[PDB]
Amino acid sequence: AAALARLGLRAVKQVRVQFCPFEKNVESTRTFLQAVSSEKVRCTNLNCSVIADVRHDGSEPCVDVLFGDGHRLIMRGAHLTAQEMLTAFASHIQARG
Amino acid sequence: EALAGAPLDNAPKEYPPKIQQLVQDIASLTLLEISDLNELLKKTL
Amino acid sequence: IQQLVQDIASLTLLEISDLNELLKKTL
Amino acid sequence: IQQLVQDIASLTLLEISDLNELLKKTLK
Amino acid sequence: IQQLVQDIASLTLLEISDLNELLKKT
Amino acid sequence: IQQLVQDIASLTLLEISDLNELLKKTL
Amino acid sequence: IQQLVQDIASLTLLEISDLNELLKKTL
Amino acid sequence: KPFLEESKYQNLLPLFVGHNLLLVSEEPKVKEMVRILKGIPFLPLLGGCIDDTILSRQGFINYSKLPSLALVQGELVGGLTFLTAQTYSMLQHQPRQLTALLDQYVKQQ
DSSP states (O other), X not given: OHHHHTTOGGGEXXXXXXXXXXXXXXXXXXXXXXXXXXXXXXXXXXXOEEEEEEOSSOOOOEEEEEETTTEEEEEOOXXXXXXXXXXXXXXHHHHOO | XXXXXXXXXXXXXXXXXXXXXXXXXXXXXXXXXXXXXXXHHHHHO | OHXXXXXXXXXXXXXXXXXXXXXXXXX | OHHHHHHHHXXXXXXXXXXXXXXXXXXX | OHHHHHHHHTSBHHHHXXXXXXXXXX | OHHHXXXXXXXXXXXXXXXXXXXXXXO | OHHHHHHHHSOOXXXXXXXXXXXXXXX | OHXXXXXXTGGGGGGTTSOOOOXXXXXXXXXXXXXXXXXXXXXXXXXXXXXXXXXXXXHHHHHXXXXXXXXXXXXXXXXXXXXXXXXXXXXXHHHHHHHHXXXXXXXXX
């Protein structure tokens, strides 16, 4: 959550996280949620909304992030680890923006 | 013991066993026991 | 009139349901 | 069920109204 | 009007069913 | 039931409103 | 009659609502 | 976690793997709990049990839109006596067809 704060999230439009709480594989995506939801990252820009989509049946956890490059970054955490998602997020959404 | 497993939106067609055996025990009654039933439910609620 | 109320009082709930549906279909 | 519709079908009008009256008396 | 309610009240349910069925076809 | 359809079709509007009041009163 | 009223008093809100909707559909 | 796996509630085990916050309600009203969570979009409600009923978020959305137990127990008696009310309504609908018809003829002139 700190490495996201240092990186100036203001280049982002909308961040949603779609996941399924009763699956065994979702801990990673959750960790991502609480990393982006933190006060530092949340207050870097007020133009960005963070939406948590919670469903029992969907069965596939997902993270979708739009930003003002006209870019859409969608990472499906299934077997992906938390800090791999956050590193991918950092190098992807910072270097472009 | 253990509790329910929480089925949800995309597919749940499944209604409980209790409601069904209740409407069955309701449907098996003669109309005098249906009026008795109706009075005993009208009074308590 | 009395034997009708007494024969209606001996029917199970399913049968007075089917009876009401027949009374709606006919009249 | 069919015997009942047949028996109610043979009642005159004052008797079907006495039937509705007695059913609203008993069951209400 | 009175003889009409007497003659309607003497009708069995099938004949009032056919009476109202023939009055519905107008 | 045909002479009754003729008797009801030969009635004016006030006699059918009175017919209605007396047929609602009887039952 | 009593087991029915006890099993009715035992149901949660969701299940008394499903019961009410199935009794609205059946009857 | 071990308390909950030895509990009757063990189906909530997959929920606590991350961080969590336990919302406690005595004499619950769920729509009121959902009202505040609605204000904050990034703060998800995951599982739960409302009066022994284990639900996902959708089950909470369903329990929310529901009336009180008093209103539901109140409509129960009408839904159960609907059969008798309907036998009498349909047996008394035979005399009202005559009224509706004759008044339909008085309506034409």
